[PDB]
Amino acid sequence: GKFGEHLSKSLIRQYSYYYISYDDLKTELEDNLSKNNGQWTQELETDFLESLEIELDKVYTFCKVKHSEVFRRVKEVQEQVQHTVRLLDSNNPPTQLDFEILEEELSDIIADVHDLAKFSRLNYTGFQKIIKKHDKKTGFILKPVFQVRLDSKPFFKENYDELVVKISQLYDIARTSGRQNFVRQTTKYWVHPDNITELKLIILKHLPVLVFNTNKEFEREDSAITSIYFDNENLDLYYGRLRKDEGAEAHRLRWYGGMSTDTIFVERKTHREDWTGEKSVKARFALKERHVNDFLKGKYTVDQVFAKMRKEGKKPMNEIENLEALASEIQYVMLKKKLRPVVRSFYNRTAFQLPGDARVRISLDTELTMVREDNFDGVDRTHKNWRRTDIGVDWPFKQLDDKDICRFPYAVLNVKLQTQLGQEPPEWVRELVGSHLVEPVPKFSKFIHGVATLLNDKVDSIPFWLP
Numbered sequence: 001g002k003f004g005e006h007l008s009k010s011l012i013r014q015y016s017y018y019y020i021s022y023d024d025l026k027t028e029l030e031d032n033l034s035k036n037n038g039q040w041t042q043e044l045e046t047d048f049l050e051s052l053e054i055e056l057d058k059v060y061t062f063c064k065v066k067h068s069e070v071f072r073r074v075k076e077v078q079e080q081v082q083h084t085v086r087l088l089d090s091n092n093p094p095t096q097l098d099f100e101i102l103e104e105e106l107s108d109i110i111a112d113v114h115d116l117a118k119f120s121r122l123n124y125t126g127f128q129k130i131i132k133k134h135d136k137k138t139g140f141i142l143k144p145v146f147q148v149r150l151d152s153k154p155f156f157k158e159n160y161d162e163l164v165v166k167i168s169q170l171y172d173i174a175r176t177s178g179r180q181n182f183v184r185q186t187t188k189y190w191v192h193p194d195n196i197t198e199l200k201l202i203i204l205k206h207l208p209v210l211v212f213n214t215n216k217e218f219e220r221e222d223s224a225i226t227s228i229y230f231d232n233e234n235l236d237l238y239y240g241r242l243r244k245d246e247g248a249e250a251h252r253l254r255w256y257g258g259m260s261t262d263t264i265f266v267e268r269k270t271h272r273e274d275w276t277g278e279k280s281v282k283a284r285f286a287l288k289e290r291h292v293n294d295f296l297k298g299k300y301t302v303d304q305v306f307a308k309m310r311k312e313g314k315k316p317m318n319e320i321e322n323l324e325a326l327a328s329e330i331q332y333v334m335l336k337k338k339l340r341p342v343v344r345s346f347y348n349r350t351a352f353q354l355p356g357d358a359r360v361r362i363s364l365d366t367e368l369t370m371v372r373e374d375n376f377d378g379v380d381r382t383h384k385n386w387r388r389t390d391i392g393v394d395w396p397f398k399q400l401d402d403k404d405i406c407r408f409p410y411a412v413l414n415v416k417l418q419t420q421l422g423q424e425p426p427e428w429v430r431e432l433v434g435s436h437l438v439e440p441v442p443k444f445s446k447f448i449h450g451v452a453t454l455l456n457d458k459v460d461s462i463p464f465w466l467p
Contacts, residue, residue, distance in 0.1 A: 001026075004129040011122060012115055018062040019119070020055055020126035029137050040138040048134070052127075052146075059123050063155045066116050071159075073109050074166060077102065081170050083263055083286070085212045086256040088177070089351035089363045091186070091269070092282035096178060097319075103174040105314065109167060113160065120156035169215070176355035182420045189438035191411040196366060199413070199437050203352045203362055206428050210351035212256075221258035223348040224393045225365075227267070228253045228373060228386060229447045230334070231342040235458060238342075238451045242461060246273050249333060250447060253292065259392040264292050268330055285323050292386045296334050302327045341373035341382050343450035346395065347412070360429050361416040367395045370406035370450035376458060406453045412446070413438055441465055 008022050028051060032044050081102060084094045127150060131142045191199055212222070230251040231237040240248035250269035255261040267284040287295060287305065294300035302324050310320065333339065347365040373381060373388060381388050381404070391397045397405060415433060419425045432438065444465060452462045 001129055001133055004126070004133070008122065008126060012119065015062070015115075015119065018058060020059060020123050020130070022126050022130055025051060025055070025130050026133065029134060033137060040140060045140055052130075056127075059155055063116070063120060063157075066112075066119075067157055067159070070109060070112050070116065071163065073112065074163060074170075077105055077109065077170060078166070079262075080105075081173050082212045083256070085173065085177075085210065087265075088210060088353065089349055089361075090254075091280070092267075092284065093358070093361075094177075099174045099178045101315065103171070103178070106167065106171050106174060110171075113163065113167070117156055117160075120154065123155055124150060166215070173355075179356055182418055185417040185419070187415050187417075187433065188441050188444040189413040189415065189433070190441050190444075191364070191413050191438055193409075193411065195437045196364070196411050200350060200364065202428075202432065202437075203364075206426070207352035207354055207360060207362060210353055221393050223350060224257060224395075225347055225349050226255055226393065227345045227446070228341050229343045229345065229450070230339040231451070232338050232340070233376060235342070235451060235455070236337060237339070238448065238459070239461065241269075241271065241445065242448055242452075242463060244271055244273075244278070244443075247271070251330065251333065251339060252447070253386060257393075262288065264289050264386075266295075266327070266330055268326070283326050285327055295331065296339075296386060298331060298335055302331065340375070341386060341388075343447060343454060344371035344373050344388065344391075345369075345446040345450060346371065346393070346397075347446075348395075358416075358418040360425060361418070362429075363414045365412040365414070368408035368410075368412060368446070369395065369397065370408070370446070370454055371397065371400065372404040372454050374455065376455065404454070406450060408449070410439075412444065 005022055005026070008019075011019050025048075028048060032047075033040065036044070084098060084102065087094050127146055131146045135141050135143055230253070237249060237251065241250050248271040252267045252269075254265045254267050255263070264287050265284050266287050268282070270281040270283075272279045272281050285305075291300050291305070295305065305327055306320065306324060309315065345368075347368045350364045350366065352362045352364075353360075371388065371391060375381065381390075383389065391400060396407060415429065417425055417429070424430075433440070445463075448463055449465070452459050452466055456462070
């Protein structure tokens, strides 16, 4: 058909080969009708049906290949959004640009599912139109044959309705979490174990409990957060953070969940002093567990870290080199100052925050423990690895010796305020910070507490909160 081939040419030109060869099948009918003097035979029917089978196999395999591609792209961004949601509770939450990149990637997948739906509906129409022309130009009827064979087992699978619901769930996270001059106030508090459940019930009535996966049953390992703090034999980074010196750095390797966690966050906290007050510049980057050991040693270069990140090409040119300069800075401080694992900080965090609202952000750290990771006493705990393998997320870790583990008797409540200039925060948080339930501890640190308790013999200067 002329109208059938005219609408066919308005296809996705990027995949023109995998579409139905309508013009080739149209000429095959007319050229075979030119010979044998306008008469079609059973031998001529087998040759045409064999050509349709080559076309069907070509369209079905392409639909099967592109089905696996979109399902893999969603599975990858589902892991990416679960990482960013887990990062909203930390001292450095993801910026508005980080959610814009996830939105751009989700919209790119929406276009891929759209193109795949357009490919299937045009090829189905193409097969129905070539059979309509076959039954018109030739006496043999194929209309009941191909309308039954294509209605059952179609080009576009039924599995996409499940995918549409999941795509919408991840897109809503990027929409809700997204959206000038305001004062920032971060305060830490000690909570008694009797007050933990009482405090959780008060905050959930104003700020909801932040859940990462949602489409999965509640697990014990989900709320767990483990950070491996790095320092040298002289403990130079500890004294710098304790004395609050200019440019004092704090290096840690953090992972969310159990021991099966793939992504390891190389986190750095830098103390900066100015006329406005005290400012803590926090910066980090993602790294696979198999590449961590060689990165700290120097064997795994910065260009090898962002090798898969550069070939993707969906991040800004200025942001890629910012993460590259940050990775080279940490790798240099790791080798120059000769840093190694010193203290491990384990705790189950319950995050409380409204999506797209930074005004009041509260988190409760329960089951807080300090674990020895050093070799200063002549005991190889790490066995030349970035973390201890004898302990994981299995709290209270009863297998460890009393001198290696420090079970904190309280729960740490982190209240982060971001109130606008010339405005007062809500009355409920103002009443909670000054209540009997919490004990205000200014500038408390899990790293400083762990080093000063577990390595008290090696340290000369200790914080005000000890013992």
